[PDB]
Symmetry: C2
Subunit: 143 residues, 2 copies
């Protein structure tokens, strides 16, 4: 449906901006009242914060760190509202204080809402997938 | 507002169900088409999965593990849609495989939508707050 197609396009735009180190391209895909929560629990309030932080980290720790889409599971949750759970593979990187982060899958929630016929992101929330934990997911014994 | 009041009540109900080990109460605060992403990136699809997993972990690794609400930052994002970013303090616990997880703050997204006058959660996503990383938050430099 419309929301699924729209959020897929927004996700592609986000990844292009990330991978080409073009953080000046993020603002146009978020509403001003957007929010974000990153992999270490930093909470960004409003688009300007989202963009400032994305820009800062793409200049430093993520300047050579590519992200790769694996799957997008997008759905409409209400008229004018689309939710996606994205699985990506992120390159290894070093934190500002020198900790080596391994190449890993991330699990990213993205939410897009439609206003005046136009879709943009309103929220993102990212978590690193722990590969040591995955086989103990209880839903694997259902059915 | 109305979205923020409705989601505030759902959040209190979620935490009460967690802390009192009453996972049978979760089914009533999620829509059937809900989803969830936990602190280790496990992705649950549909309410039956969300409740099954919450129940399994509350019976085992989280049987004595409380979550304390610190702050709720809730807002309307569309008519009938309310988004909250919740800060909570989670007790230490041991993972199924035997790793010790320390007491920590978590940053939890909760999304509620209204259908026929009733609100329930459609999605949740949780991330552990890394206290070592926090001083690197670029927004502190704006």
């Amino acid at each position: 449906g419309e929301g699924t197609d729209a959020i897929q396009a927004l996700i592609q735009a986000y990844f292009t901006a990330w991978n080409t180190n073009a953080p000046e391209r993020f603002a146009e895909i978020f509403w001003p009242d957007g929010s974000w929560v990153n992999v270490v629990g930093m909470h960004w309030r409003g688009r300007d914060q989202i963009v400032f932080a994305h820009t800062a980290f793409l200049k430093t720790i993520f300047k050579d760190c590519k992200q790769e889409l694996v799957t997008i599971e997008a759905r409409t949750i209400a008229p004018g509202s689309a939710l996606a759970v994205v699985t990506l593979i992120q390159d290894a990187y070093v934190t500002p204080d020198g900790r080596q982060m391994p190449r890993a899958h991330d699990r990213l929630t993205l939410l897009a809402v439609e206003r005046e016929g136009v879709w943009r992101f309103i929220h993102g929330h990212n978590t690193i997938v722990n590969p040591d934990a995955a086989n103990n997911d209880p839903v694997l014994r259902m059915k």
